Structure formats: C-alpha cells, structure tokens
Design a protein around this ligand. Structure first.
Ligand code: A1BXJ
Lengths: 39, 156
C-alpha cells in the first residue's frame, strides 16, 4: 500500500553538476511500453 | 493529504523496511508518475487517498486526482536538468544535453544518466522550471549503461 512524501520544489538550479552525453539511438516501443534497440 | 506542487518519493512498506519504488510530480492538484511505479494502484498522502484517473501502459504514464497537466516539450536544442530523487538520497539537479530515440513514429528526447530503478518518475526540466517529461523508461546500450526517454503526456 503505497504512499508519497514531498522531496523538493521543481526549480532550475544555476551551476548544478553538468554531465552525461547525447547518443542518437534507433529504438522500437512494443505494446507493453518496453523500449528496445533496433540494429 | 499534501497537495503542494513539487516532486515526491513513492514509497511502499509491502517489503523489508520502507522501500522507494519511484518519484512523481504534483502540479495543479494532480500527481504524475510512470505506470511501472504504481501499476495503477491507489496511493496514500498521510491520511488522504489518491485515486488513479488516467493511465496508459504503452506511454508508461499515470495521473492521480485529475487529467495529465504537464505539456512542456524539449525544444530539441537546449540542455535540460534531471531533478533526480534517488532512494535514501536528497533531491539533486543533474544538467545534461539530451540525445535522441529515433522510432518509426518519430524522434523522442533521451537523457544518458544512470540512476537506481527507484528514481523512475523523477522529472526532467527546461530553463524556465517547467517539466518536459519523466525519467525511468529507456534502454540498456552496448556498454551496459542506461538511457531514459524523456517521456511526456498529452494535456487535453
Ligand atoms: C529492473 C529491470 O530492468 C529494467 O527494465 C530497468 C533497468 N534500469 C533502470 C534504470 C537504471 N539504471 C532506471 C530506471 C528504470 C530502469 C529499469 N526499468
């Protein structure tokens, strides 16, 4: 039996940790809402 | 229950201790998360009850108390922030330039940030603070790292 607790405001934070890349991926979305990689 | 706008952890006690299964956004009285977090179950907010209103297993989205309200979109150019809310850990912004999911049905923004499964539903934001979609439905790539779609709903 699930419950919610508040974790913060939703705000853009100037000078936050910038990271991660930007890959272009060919993908398929099945009827179950699972993404897969086409190749 | 608590109806204040913001980001919330989705907890269960049906396992050992209190386990974080996911995250969501409260906006205009409506709670927005991913379907795979709740499976469409009702939610507690203290003593208040949150009942599902709209959901779709293919979009992997669900709203509580009203229709999906979040309609901002990635502009296709600018960097974004994941407001990651990991299990046991404080809310933390992570700034990234999204990649792209290319599908037969069009292109979707994607963020290459690996966080625990319990982080599913954490909102992705733009420069103006508006939620452009939620984190937690994506793929595992050649390396073994995780890439999430920027999953956004429709506002009717
Ligand atoms: C658990 C079964 O494997 C998966 O399909 C699955 C794998 N990883 C994630 C991550 C990461 N990292 C973040 C958010 C959701 C997932 C996720 N659903």
């Amino acid at each position: 039996d699930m419950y919610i607790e508040r974790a913060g405001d939703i705000t853009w934070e100037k000078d936050a940790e910038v990271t991660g890349n930007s890959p272009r991926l060919d993908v398929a979305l099945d009827e179950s809402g699972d993404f897969s990689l086409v190749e | 229950g608590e109806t204040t706008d913001g980001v919330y952890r989705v907890m269960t006690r049906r396992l050992l201790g209190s386990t974080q299964v996911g995250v969501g956004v409260m906006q205009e009285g409506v709670f927005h998360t991913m379907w795979h977090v709740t499976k469409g179950a009702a939610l507690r907010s203290g003593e208040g009850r949150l009942d599902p209103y709209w959901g779709d297993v293919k979009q992997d989205l669900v709203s509580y108390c009203g229709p999906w309200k979040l309609d901002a979109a990635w502009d296709g150019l600018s960097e974004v922030q994941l407001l990651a809310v990991p299990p046991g850990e404080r809310a933390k912004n992570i700034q990234t330039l999204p990649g792209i999911f290319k599908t037969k049905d069009g292109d979707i923004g994607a963020v290459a940030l690996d966080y625990p499964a319990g982080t599913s539903g954490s909102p992705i934001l733009d420069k103006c603070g508006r939620v452009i979609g939620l984190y937690g439905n994506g793929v595992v790539i050649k390396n073994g790292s995780y890439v999430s779609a920027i999953t956004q709903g429709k506002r009717e």
